[PDB]
Subunit: 213 residues, 4 copies
Amino acid sequence: AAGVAFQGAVQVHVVDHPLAAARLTTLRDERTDNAGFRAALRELTLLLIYEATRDAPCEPVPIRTPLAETVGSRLTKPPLLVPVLRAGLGMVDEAHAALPEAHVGFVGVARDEQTHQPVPYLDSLPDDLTDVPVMVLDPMVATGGSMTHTLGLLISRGAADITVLCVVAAPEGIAALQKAAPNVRLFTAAIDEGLNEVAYIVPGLGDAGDRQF
Amino acid sequence: VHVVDHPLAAARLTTLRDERTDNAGFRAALRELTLLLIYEATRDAPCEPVPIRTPLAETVGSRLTKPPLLVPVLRAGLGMVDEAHAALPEAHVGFVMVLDPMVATGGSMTHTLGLLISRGAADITVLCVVAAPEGIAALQKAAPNVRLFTAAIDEGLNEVAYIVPGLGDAGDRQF
Amino acid sequence: AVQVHVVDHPLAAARLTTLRDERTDNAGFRAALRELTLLLIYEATRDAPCEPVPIRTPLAETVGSRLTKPPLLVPVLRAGLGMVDEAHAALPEAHVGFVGVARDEQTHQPVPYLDSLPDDLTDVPVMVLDPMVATGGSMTHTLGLLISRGAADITVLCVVAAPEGIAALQKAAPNVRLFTAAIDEGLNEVAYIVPGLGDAGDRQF
Amino acid sequence: GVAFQGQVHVVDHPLAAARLTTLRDERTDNAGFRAALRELTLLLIYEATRDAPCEPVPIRTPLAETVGSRLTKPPLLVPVLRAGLGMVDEAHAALPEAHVGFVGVARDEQTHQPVPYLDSLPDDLTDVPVMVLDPMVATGGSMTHTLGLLISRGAADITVLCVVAAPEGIAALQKAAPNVRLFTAAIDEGLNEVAYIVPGLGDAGDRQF
């Protein structure tokens, strides 16, 4: 937990938190059913959301309360959340709960049976100009192709500071992160060994989408 | 006394305070705030390894060895627990992490902590959203090893012994 | 006795089957409980009232309905708080009151403890929530203090019922209505419902 | 409380009507809008799944052996993106065993026709029930697009869940598919200049995201 620097000075932060570890140990077990995999994934997403939303600026708000008037606080950056589909959709339906005020955009990638190159059909996103913080929500950061391709259109609209949330990433994937966007930050629950013949992360979680749907 | 100044916390606390907010949003911004308290207060927690196998290959995870006995204090700290079970699924529950939105005077809490360590309760953690100096004063008066996690420290209580500014009556704003 | 309503719905039966299996982890036990509750709520809230109310859409003026008299929820603890935090969702407008009870491992009696409510007056519908209505002592104790304040119509939502428990119900109150997922065989040596689910409390806490 | 037309079933339930009223209100926060949506989704599921738990289950309780039931043939859920995803993380709650498929389309500004795109779909042949989830069945284009590719893969009986439908959308349904079943909480008068349903709720997506 620091986490590491890597090649393009890609900054990674490893959520080593105990309840993080426990949810993670639930997510990888092959004994666990898709329900418990969805629920484990969800509660694990707020952990990442919390570790990433630390240095998020704020803003005072004039407020009442019961028994007289007082002043509170309210975050000031409106985080665009971006689920990478298919897999990053369990993560979003209560990042909302963590971040109610935050808006959602849709871009993603899907992999070929053999070549493994990302397929790109979709474009339903905001007017994502400059000063807009963007968290990308993808569980398995594997080769990077899927990740690299979303950020490819993020930065095309001039996406500012980028954070990426993921349960597990691989040294291949983070490397293709540095090559793509040197000033994006990455939050994982674990770094792994690497990929395999089928570019699945190992040990990892299996196919993250399949065991939610 | 550990004050969770995290922005999501300060936000959620801002919402609990507000008079405009419905009990439901009150109940929603409380449960969600209780998670942050859990996350800060469990960050030095002892663990334990677990041999498991993934669908692909075999490895070793971490249990957390000694999960806590939650204790919610009635009537107020039960809108906390039905989401604290989400954070800690293996936590057992009693009626130690003590769960109570307003530590005001401290009697309700210390009366609980008196029967906690009666039986032999080691390290205790307390979780509230708001505390009064009076209540914290009562605390170490009773157990001076306990730790306390709160979203803010307020001025103190008033004539009726409510925390000011505070949120009102935390029980009344959920039930 | 009477009046029982068995929720024999497809999803309801699957959730009960999960709740009964001993193989199921208590996280899955609370989740299947949680889910199985709304089904009971949905059935018990079919002959509820409505207003209608004037509201405005982003596009036109219209009228909807709400509930005129949303019920006072009364979870029976220790067991019945896995039930209530999702009933909340189904009925946002419902208020909550609390009492708890504890049946012994010898005397067979519940040591009731709780008196945390909204004082009585109406003409207030009440939905008492507790998963196992076995002996009836826990239930009957609660209903005594509900109708002590003058409780009108009482609904009881539970997971499983025993004939002995239902027998005590119309011993205490013959006008309450009961919604169960199943009526079982009865109790045992230890005043547990057989086949049942075991202890409903222990399997969430 | 259900109801019928003449395929269409209007869920006139007290909680459904209470939850519906909340979805239209403009005063409600989008969080409460999605919270109100979440509950009203299950109500529709419960009314629409009055059927099929035709498997008994041998199980054993902590106090002796007994037999229960589960559901045979659990439906493939198909939320229409981006709107009907506030619905599906809790349909999951209703139907734990249900697998999920994705197939979204938006509506264009002017023009009219939905620019379609989306093929994240399981291995579907014949005897597989489908419950499509989308809050607003307006023009019918978004829906029929989905159903066009569902029944390309030989989809059997199809159910559609929505919060409100317009007469124009249901018109579009039975010309695309005359055997599909529809479940809404209310039937409104219709669409407007820009093809929003009036009274409706405004835009169901924007009111969650």
